C-alpha cells in the first residue's frame, strides 16, 4: 500500500539502487510494490525479488539461530532469552507470511513459461521451509506438508519442461534435498535426490546455456558439497 503511488518502473529502478546500497529491507519493499502492480515479473525482476527477501529472512534466520542456541544452552534463568527469541521469530514468520501471500495472491499462475512457474513454486517451498525451521505444534505438520507439496509440484514441472542443467531446476533440487535432510528427517531421500540431480546434470552437461552456465556449475558444486557432508 505504501508503494501504490509509485510507478512500476520507478519501483524496479529503486530496488536496483537499494541492492547497490545493501538496503535489502527497502529493496524488498520496492519489489513488493512492483509485484502489487499486477504485471508479471521478468527473470531479472524475479532475481531482485528473490535477493531482497532472501537477505531479509536470511538475517532473521541467522539471528534466530544464535538466540535459539543461547536458549538451549541455558536450558541444559530469566525469561529474557526466550522473549527475545520469540520476538525475532515473530518477525521472521511475518516476512515469510508476506512472501507466501505475494506468491499466492499475485505470482503463482497456471500460465507463464516454465522458469517462472518453477521459480515461484520453489520460492513457496523455501519460505514454508523457513517457517518449518521455527515451527512446533499443529502448525508444524501443516507447514511441512505445504513445503513438500510446493517443492514436488516444482520438480514435476522442471523435469518435464527444463534441461537437467537449468539453474532453476538445479537450485530447486538442491533446496528440496536440504528440505529432505534438515526438515523432513529423510537423509536417504536427500542423498538420492542430490546424487540423481548431480549425475543427471553431468550426463547432459552439453545442455548448459551460455547465459547461465556459471550459475548451473555453482549449484552442481553445492550438490557435491552436500553429498560429501552427508556421506
Amino acid at each position: 500500500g505504501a508503494m501504490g503511488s509509485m510507478e512500476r518502473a520507478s519501483l524496479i529502478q529503486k530496488a536496483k539502487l537499494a541492492e547497490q546500497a545493501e538496503r535489502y529491507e527497502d529493496m524488498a519493499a520496492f519489489m513488493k510494490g512492483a509485484v502489487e502492480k499486477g504485471e508479471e515479473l521478468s527473470c531479472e525482476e524475479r532475481n531482485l525479488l528473490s535477493v531482497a527477501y532472501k537477505n531479509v529472512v536470511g538475517g532473521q534466520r541467522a539471528a534466530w539461530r544464535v538466540l535459539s542456541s543461547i536458549e538451549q544452552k541455558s536450558n541444559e534463568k530469566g525469561p529474557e532469552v526466550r522473549e527475545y527469541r520469540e520476538k525475532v521469530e515473530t518477525e521472521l514468520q511475518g516476512v515469510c507470511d508476506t512472501v507466501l501471500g505475494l506468491l499466492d495472491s499475485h505470482l503463482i499462475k497456471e500460465a507463464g513459461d516454465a522458469e517462472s512457474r518453477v521459480f515461484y513454486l520453489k520460492m513457496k517451498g523455501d519460505y514454508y521451509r523457513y517457517l518449518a525451521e521455527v515451527a512446533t505444534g499443529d502448525d508444524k505438520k501443516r507447514i511441512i506438508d505445504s513445503a513438500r507439496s510446493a517443492y514436488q509440484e516444482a520438480m514435476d514441472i522442471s523435469k518435464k519442461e527444463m534441461p537437467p542443467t537449468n539453474p532453476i531446476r538445479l537450485g530447486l533440487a538442491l533446496n528440496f534435498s536440504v528440505f529432505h535432510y534438515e526438515i523432513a528427517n529423510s537423509p536417504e531421500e536427500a542423498i538420492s535426490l542430490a546424487k540423481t540431480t548431480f549425475d543427471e546434470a553431468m550426463a547432459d552437461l552439453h545442455t548448459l546455456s551460455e547465459d547461465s552456465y556459471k550459475d548451473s556449475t555453482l549449484i552442481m558444486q553445492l550438490l557435491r558439497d552436500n553429498l560429501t557432508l552427508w556421506t
Binding site: N47, V51, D126, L174, D215, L218, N226, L229
Partner: peptide
C-alpha cells in the same frame, strides 16, 4: 555444519 541451500547471486 548446516547443509547448503541455493545462494544469492547477481
Amino acid at each position: 555444519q548446516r547443509s547448503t541451500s541455493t545462494p544469492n547471486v547477481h
